Design a protein around this ligand. Structure first.
Ligand SMILES: NC(=O)c1ccc[n+]([C@@H]2O[C@H](COP(=O)([O-])OP(=O)(O)OC[C@@H]3O[C@@H](n4cnc5c(N)ncnc54)[C@@H](OP(=O)(O)O)[C@H]3O)[C@H](O)[C@@H]2O)c1
Ligand SMILES: NC(=O)c1ccc[n+]([C@@H]2O[C@H](COP(=O)([O-])OP(=O)(O)OC[C@@H]3O[C@@H](n4cnc5c(N)ncnc54)[C@@H](OP(=O)(O)O)[C@H]3O)[C@H](O)[C@@H]2O)c1
Ligand SMILES: C[C@]12CC[C@H]3C(=CCc4cc(O)ccc43)[C@@H]1CCC2=O
Lengths: 284, 284
């Protein structure tokens, strides 16, 4: 039994690099359980693990589908240590395009995986972290949870929710000695954006010409803004570590300092109209 | 034909008061379409209608439950005027209790009804609104959407979600000529909130003695604040009018100023920890 860490969505991006960063730590103090929605996807994980010579006994891959309470509790009973000190809610789905262009199923999944799942992860672990009176939880934050971005309604929705689920919980947990931290990310080189963008071409068939133009117009800005500050998933894991070490973690950590002006100004405007203006005359 | 309004969840409270205040308006300008999850409950709606002397034809009820796109779809094809100049997304439910004490069917229902349902509506009316190049969208806000409240994890989760859903939409919507704005309200004279009396063993047989205690103490504080801050839908509906009247309404209307200093605090702290301290000290 050492610092037992249970992380979700370890198949790629931040969930992978993190699992291996923690597991391969030179102070061999982290015993990580990298969970995966689907195990068949644990190749690149193991490959990296080997690439770092991440010592025997530290990383045990486990399967965990966030949109399944059955799948979650079982992956919990499989924690031989019988305790989790750090839980990391990381799984998540993206969604882009004209709101009217998405579908009900699509929308449900995003909120299903990104929010409810975070609830299942919490519901199953927090109890035990509470009677114990010690524990740490980390949730992969996002800009879209602190501000609104065009054609990112449902994702910014799923991420704004997490701000809610966490902050309210953070309150009650104060005397409980359990710790909640939202790692607020920005763009980052992960499997996340490399496919979710789908195919911008089909959109025109479920929207008006004026939005479609604006959808590509956003895409073009997106792609430029990404290849300007998309941080390395390793750089991002670094923040997860600094929170972990903090004796008294804060409600949130920020991986990039670029979105902090938009936020600052945004908070100086309660009606939210100065923000909407800026953000708009920024994307387009 | 005149200002057509389609209000969702008018069965009671805010939804019923705005419906009738509009229909029975002096200028007899608004043609209200009060929508209900289940038509039976329109009894109390009509009572207020009658009471308010809403002329014949300025208010016709339709049935539609935002958790069934087939329903929503129908409700729009029932708006004989061919247009909806004012769309109001107001239905939705609350949820209180220790996160672990809640059920999945429950945590789901709230998310599926407060966000998805709001999305379904938008996906239905927003288009024609855009092609018209004229529109008005009112969504019932909340303080839980602006800040986290203990034992209100899932609800504030669903509420914060509307902040992003709408805020992001708003940004795209800027040039289109349609307007989206939330009505950030606080505790009002509504059954649910003032009728939170019970705390069954169901809660007890599903949380730890430490949380159990912080649960009731919450309710006690919550009953007090309500007894001293609860706003009756009456004023709240008055706010909705204030909004739709302004040539260019802002992204956020506040029915009460009682919480502005609390969120004011929120502003000056990126770590979100000053608040978690404050709002805990203030709840417990
Ligand atoms: N970096 C980003 O742009 C970014 C921004 C803000 C926050 N974070 C967060 O961390 C996540 C991953 O982002 P990333 O950028 O690291 O890219 P990513 O490529 O999506 O990496 C994580 C993904 O989460 C998984 N996942 C998806 N659905 C799941 C389900 N039902 N159950 C369990 N796991 C599931 C993984 O497996 P599968 O491929 O098998 O689905 C996976 O690739 C979140 O979705 C979230 O947005 C990332
Ligand atoms: N006022 C509050 O404390 C408050 C605070 C912030 C924001 N708002 C927002 O607007 C709502 C209502 O608050 P209120 O204070 O007016 O009282 P309320 O009693 O909840 O009024 C609106 C209600 O939503 C309905 N609804 C429920 N499930 C539905 C479904 N599945 N499909 C369609 N409609 C459904 C109504 O019909 P049925 O009874 O037949 O279900 C109804 O009375 C939201 O839930 C939300 O919190 C209210
Ligand atoms: C929200 C986000 C960070 C911010 C980024 C994103 C989308 C659009 C966008 C637009 C901006 O003007 C500045 C930054 C970003 C990312 C999508 C995934 C993510 O975490």
């Amino acid at each position: 039994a050492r610092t037992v860490v249970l992380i979700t969505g370890c198949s790629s991006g931040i969930g992978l690099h993190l699992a291996v960063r923690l597991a391969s730590d030179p102070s061999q103090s982290f015993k990580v359980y990298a969970t995966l929605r689907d195990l068949k996807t644990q190749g690149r994980l193991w490959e990296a693990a080997r690439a770092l010579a991440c010592p025997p006994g530290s990383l045990e891959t486990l399967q965990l589908d966030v949109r399944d309470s059955k799948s979650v509790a079982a992956a919990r009973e499989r924690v031989t240590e019988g305790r989790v000190d750090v839980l990391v809610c990381n799984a998540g789905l993206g969604l882009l395009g004209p709101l009217e262009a998405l579908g009900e199923d699509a929308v449900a999944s995003v909120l299903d995986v990104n929010v409810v799942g975070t609830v299942r992860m919490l519901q199953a672990f927090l109890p035990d972290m509470k009677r114990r009176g010690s524990g740490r939880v980390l949730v992969t934050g996002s800009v879209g949870g602190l501000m609104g971005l065009p054609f990112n309604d449902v994702y910014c929705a799923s991420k704004f929710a997490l701000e809610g689920l966490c902050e309210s919980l953070a309150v009650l947990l104060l005397p409980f000695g359990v710790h909640l931290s939202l790692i607020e990310c920005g763009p980052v080189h992960t499997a996340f954006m490399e496919k979710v963008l789908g195919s911008p071409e089909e959109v025109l068939d479920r929207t008006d010409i004026h939005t479609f133009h604006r959808f590509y117009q956003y895409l073009a800005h997106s792609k430029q803004v990404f290849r300007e500050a998309a941080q390395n998933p390793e750089e991002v894991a670094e923040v997860f570590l600094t929170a972990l070490r903090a004796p008294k973690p804060t409600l949130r950590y920020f991986t990039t300092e670029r979105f902090l002006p938009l936020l600052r100004m945004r908070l100086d405007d309660p009606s939210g109209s100065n923000y909407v203006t800026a953000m708009h005359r920024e994307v387009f």
